[PDB]
Ligand binder design. Structure first.
Ligand code: ATP
Ligand code: MG
Length: 120
DNA sequence: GTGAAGGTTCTCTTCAGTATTAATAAGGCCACTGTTAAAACGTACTATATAGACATCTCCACAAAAG
C-alpha cells in the first residue's frame, strides 16, 4: 500500500541544508583549525543538535593498516547529571574502547591516551 | 650368689555416636544515587500607627429707615 510508505517516510527525520547549519559548520571549522574551545547556545528546537550532528557526519573517521582509527571530531551527548567517570565512558565508548574497571583517575588516564591515540 | 639380662601375660571393647539454651556481628573499599535534617535566605498578603494639607462654623464688627 502506497499510503504506508509515505506515512513511514513522513514520520522520520531528514536533514535540510539551511544556511544556519552552513554558518555553524564554517565556524566550527575555524575553531577546530585554530584548535579553539568555544560554545554553541540558542533556544530550544532552533536546530543546534541537528547542525552539530550533521557536522560529525561530515568528518567521519579514517583508518590506516595496523593502526587505530583516527576520528577528527567526536560528538557526544551526556546523560543528565553526568559525573566524570560517565563522561570518560561516553568518550571511551564513542572511540570504541572499553574500560571495565578502574578508579575515576584510571578512567581519566585511559581517556587521555585514547583521545591522543585517535588524535581527535 | 647378689646382681644383671631377659621372659612372660593381661581377657573383651555390638560400643559410641547422633538432640538443646545459642550470641549484634565479625566486609572493605570505590563510586553512584537518594533520601533526610536543617540551615540559610528571597518577598507577600497583610494590621496597623501615625503626621498634616485642607474645609468648616462661629463670634465680633460696619449702612439704611423711624421717632
Ligand atoms: N537542519 C534541520 N533540518 C531538518 N530538520 C531540522 C533541522 N534542524 C532542526 N530540525 C527539526 O527541529 C527539531 C529540533 O531540532 P534539534 O534537535 O537540532 O534541536 P536543538 O536546537 O538541539 O534543541 P534543544 O536545545 O531543545 O535540545 C529536529 O528534531 C527536527 O525535527
Ligand atoms: Mg539539542
Amino acid at each position: 500500500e502506497w499510503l504506508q510508505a509515505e506515512i513511514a517516510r513522513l514520520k522520520g527525520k531528514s536533514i535540510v541544508p539551511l544556511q544556519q547549519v552552513k554558518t555553524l559548520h564554517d565556524w566550527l571549522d575555524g575553531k577546530r583549525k585554530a584548535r579553539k574551545s568555544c560554545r554553541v547556545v540558542g533556544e530550544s528546537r532552533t536546530g543546534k543538535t541537528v547542525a552539530c550532528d550533521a557536522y560529525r557526519y561530515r568528518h567521519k573517521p579514517q583508518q590506516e593498516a595496523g593502526r587505530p582509527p583516527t576520528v577528527p571530531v567526536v560528538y557526544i551527548r551526556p546523560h543528565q547529571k553526568c559525573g566524570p567517570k560517565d563522561l570518560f565512558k561516553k568518550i571511551t565508548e564513542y572511540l570504541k574502547y572499553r574500560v571495565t574497571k578502574g578508579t575515576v583517575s584510571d578512567f581519566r588516564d585511559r581517556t587521555i591516551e585514547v583521545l591522543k591515540g585517535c588524535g581527535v
